[PDB]
Amino acid sequence: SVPLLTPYKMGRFNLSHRVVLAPLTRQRSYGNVPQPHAAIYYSQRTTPGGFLITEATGVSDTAQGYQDTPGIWTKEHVEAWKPIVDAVHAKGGIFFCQIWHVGRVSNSGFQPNGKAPISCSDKPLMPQIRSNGIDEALFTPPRRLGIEEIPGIVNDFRLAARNAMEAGFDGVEIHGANGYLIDQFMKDTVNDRTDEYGGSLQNRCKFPLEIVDAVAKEIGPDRVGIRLSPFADYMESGDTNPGALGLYMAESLNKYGILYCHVIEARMHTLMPMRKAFKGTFISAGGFTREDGNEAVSKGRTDLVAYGRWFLANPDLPKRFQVDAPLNKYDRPTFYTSDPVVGYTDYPFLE
Ligand SMILES: Cc1cc2nc3c(=O)[nH]c(=O)nc-3n(C[C@H](O)[C@H](O)[C@H](O)COP(=O)(O)O)c2cc1C
16 A cells, blocks of 8 residues: 555565665774674664665775774675674565765775875865864875776675675665765766766766676676766765766666666756666665655655665664654764664664
């Protein structure tokens, strides 16, 4: 009866409902290592046939810009993620690992040898902001990547995709949104390169398309999604022509025949052109209510809807939605704190 709670077939996966766990950075993977507490967390949010996306997961030793976000670039990361994946599988979840590199959204304190964060350009991020006291930028201005270094970062994503499979994930979500490394190349206010990776829409999408290319070759395009936010400007990532960026990307990922395109809504024409252009599954995110999502599903505006904050705060979100029970309030001050339990796995199920 309830459109959000109607099954849906995502390529070769059968989903019981359309209520997806959005990727949610929780900063509790000590030392970039996934922790057994995450096994409880994602397990609590699993339903048979539910689709879950992990928090963003680093592709390399320089992919990090916050403390305690997990990697999947070492054999060690692989082994620690296995029991988390298995717990999700035990309750019948389809579980995709979202893979990112923060690029310029970082500092020397997060980089090996204390070196500069890397980006498509050397454009400094929030220059008005310094750390407590020192006249020193909070976001250590980034090093512009040599074109000789770009294939060996695009390979970093190919390899993280490989290690996701090793850990047993069903698939991978490429984090091409929110002002991080992939979005940095795509956005015209950030990418001012005068080589083949910059200086034009096509040049600017070369990077993401190379990444999609290498991941889908590694693991199969049928296990590959990408997240885009062409309309956002998180971390100074706005585009002067966001409708064009969006359409060119959605159109351009058709060639590759990947599984899904997952897009964050603007401040609300926008998502539709991308949806009609992209032939596979479409996932919409950003400020959905139950009723917003029921409506988007029934009117064919999207196939799935990712909920981030409400799902964070309600381990049984899909059930609650099935029934319209009241939701737990989300406690913002513990989104990003570092306790294994508090504001992480102590949001309650329905009495
Ligand atoms: C605590 C917090 C962490 C997040 N971490 C990520 C991230 O790892 N990757 C990502 O693509 N989006 C991230 N998001 C965005 C969510 O996936 C989602 O798009 C956003 O919360 C808007 O959806 P909502 O209205 O359901 O909360 C995060 C959001 C919050 C609140």
